[PDB]
Design a protein around this ligand. Structure first.
Ligand SMILES: *C(=N)[C@H](C[C@@H]1CCNC1=O)NC(=O)[C@@H](CC(C)C)NC(=O)c1ccc(-c2ccc(F)cc2)cc1
Ligand SMILES: *C(=N)[C@H](C[C@@H]1CCNC1=O)NC(=O)[C@@H](CC(C)C)NC(=O)c1ccc(-c2ccc(F)cc2)cc1
Lengths: 305, 305
């Protein structure tokens, strides 16, 4: 037993990380087949980043201006293009460590692992949730851009995120691997505000199931409720509405534990109205919303890749 | 910026994991050079685990009774021995993915990453601290034994932990890679109690430095203190005594932030005497003691491997 925030094993993605240097700027790139994907602001100087005209900066770059290194080996760039906010650098060598992969764009409330990298080398791995306001609570320093987030399904790596920037509130923003930002953010050094965030209700319920499975059962009460009455109570606490799709997604957990979804909703309604009263759940004094139903099932049934 | 519990990149260790099956029991093994290391209770049946005589069970096993698989490839066992609580299986193939490695035995208060595995395949990665009572707060199901914990230093993997069992309180226990348990635990299915735990003071101070670096600065006060007076206050709250070695270990953090170690100790003394009063630090309503000073520096300076 035990329940921990846990990231996917990262080796499949470690074998794809390279360093991308243009002039004086260096960041990370993702090397898949014979293409390196990286944030387009690698072509910026310090002065350009306040309001860059990326199309203009890219015209004055040729293939040889991009120094791509995989460990101690230079990869010769033989082509380049821009796709929204990412650059694609064609190289003369296909990555022999290319895993089976997909590019996906995730929905708010879904989680992924981030492999944080500097200079093309891995530094660490941690789990993140795409917030309803399209930000993530990461840990990124200078040079971390091009670090990617991903999920794994058996042998297939689904890349969903590439890191571009930090917001004044401390949170982080990036793009899918087609270079389209999550959220209303742009890749320039200017103050940008995230929308007001919301608590991912279905993830809180998943976490409460995780808690019951791991012995923490004091918050369960004898009542049921209806979706309508639960959503009425939870709206005032800035919880996103719980849909019937969300209930259906929680179905297998409710079947495994034998606690109906609307009974757990009754328990969460009581927790929202009365607080925890000093008690903890899975060690936390706060309700946690960064575990999806699938993360709970994954960890509590031992799914491997 | 941002501060997250983050694990080491796991690919170096993923390339060493194999499945070890003896009769009807299967668990994980660590394949380094031509030796597979795994928990010795792989040679137990269900009935044996209540009080096993491991030396007796091993005499009736020969090399061929151990089925070692790396992916879809059987590794032929050509030798076997027992070293305390681990088995060493010599195989006719050296692992081509063997990283540079050491076996180390860590001290209470140190952290490591655990790569949780089932059937020789990786499931997830998470960070753990060796508690002062020699347990860890992991997430392990049946079949997880042989999963290892480790640190990475540049290119060298220091293996420090191999998982053997769960305790009635929900916590976990295991051995170093020489098979000596951490703590007063034995590898049999019997009720065993962990010693009463203690809060790792030097790790709390490291985490408070991490908080200051990341904007969370409200708990800083204008006072200093002495090691003696701090330890007097902190003893009653079940905090382990802060030694001068601990202060010296925190030295670089105090230099980077410009906050003296004994000033941060004054801040923590106030936090222990008065609580947090509803406020949080790095998102947590509790004082966190599972980040070492080195984890803080690592994450806040971008150390890669
Ligand atoms: C990638 N290597 C890097 C990652 C960030 C640096 C430190 N932490 C990060 O997450 N990206 C950038 O440095 C860069 C990219 C832009 C999009 C070209 N800029 C920013 O991340 C950034 C930082 C701060 C501000 C800002 C502006 C005004 C304020 F009042 C407050 C903050 C804007 C952009
Ligand atoms: C390894 N594959 C496995 C990992 C544990 C199984 C579930 N979670 C784990 O961490 N090890 C074992 O299953 C096994 C190993 C022994 C040392 C041979 N036993 C235990 O982990 C275990 C579990 C529970 C008790 C126990 C006894 C009495 C009680 F009142 C309460 C609990 C003892 C040993």
């Amino acid at each position: 037993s035990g329940f921990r925030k846990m990231a996917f094993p990262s080796g499949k993605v470690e074998g794809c990380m390279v360093q991308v240097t243009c002039g004086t700027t260096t960041l990370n790139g993702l090397w898949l087949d014979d293409v390196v994907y990286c944030p387009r602001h690698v072509i910026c100087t310090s002065e350009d980043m306040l309001n860059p005209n990326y199309e203009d900066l890219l015209i004055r770059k040729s293939n040889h201006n991009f120094l791509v290194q995989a460990g101690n080996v230079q990869l010769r760039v033989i082509g380049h293009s821009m796709q929204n906010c990412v650059l694609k650098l064609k190289v003369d060598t296909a990555n022999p460590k290319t895993p089976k992969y997909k590019f996906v764009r995730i929905q708010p409330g879904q989680t992924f692992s981030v492999l944080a990298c500097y200079n093309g080398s891995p530094s660490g791995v941690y789990q993140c949730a795409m917030r309803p306001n399209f930000t993530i609570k990461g840990s990124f320093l200078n040079g971390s851009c091009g670090s990617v987030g991903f999920n794994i399904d058996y042998d297939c790596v689904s890349f969903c995120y590439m890191h571009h920037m930090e917001l004044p509130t401390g949170v982080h923003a990036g793009t899918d691997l087609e270079g389209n930002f999550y959220g209303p953010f742009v890749d320039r050094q200017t103050a940008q505000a995230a929308g007001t965030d919301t608590t991912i209700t279905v993830n809180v319920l998943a976490w409460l199931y995780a808690a019951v499975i791991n012995g923490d059962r004091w918050f369960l009460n004898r009542f049921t409720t209806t979706l309508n009455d639960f959503n009425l109570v939870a709206m005032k606490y800035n919880y996103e509405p719980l849909t019937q799709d969300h209930v259906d997604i929680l179905g297998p957990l409710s079947a495994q534990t034998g606690i109906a979804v609307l009974d757990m909703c009754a328990s969460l309604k009581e927790l929202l109205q009365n607080g925890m009263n000093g008690r903890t759940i899975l060690g936390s004094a706060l309700l946690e919303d960064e575990f999806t139903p699938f993360d709970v099932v994954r960890q509590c049934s031992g799914v491997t890749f």
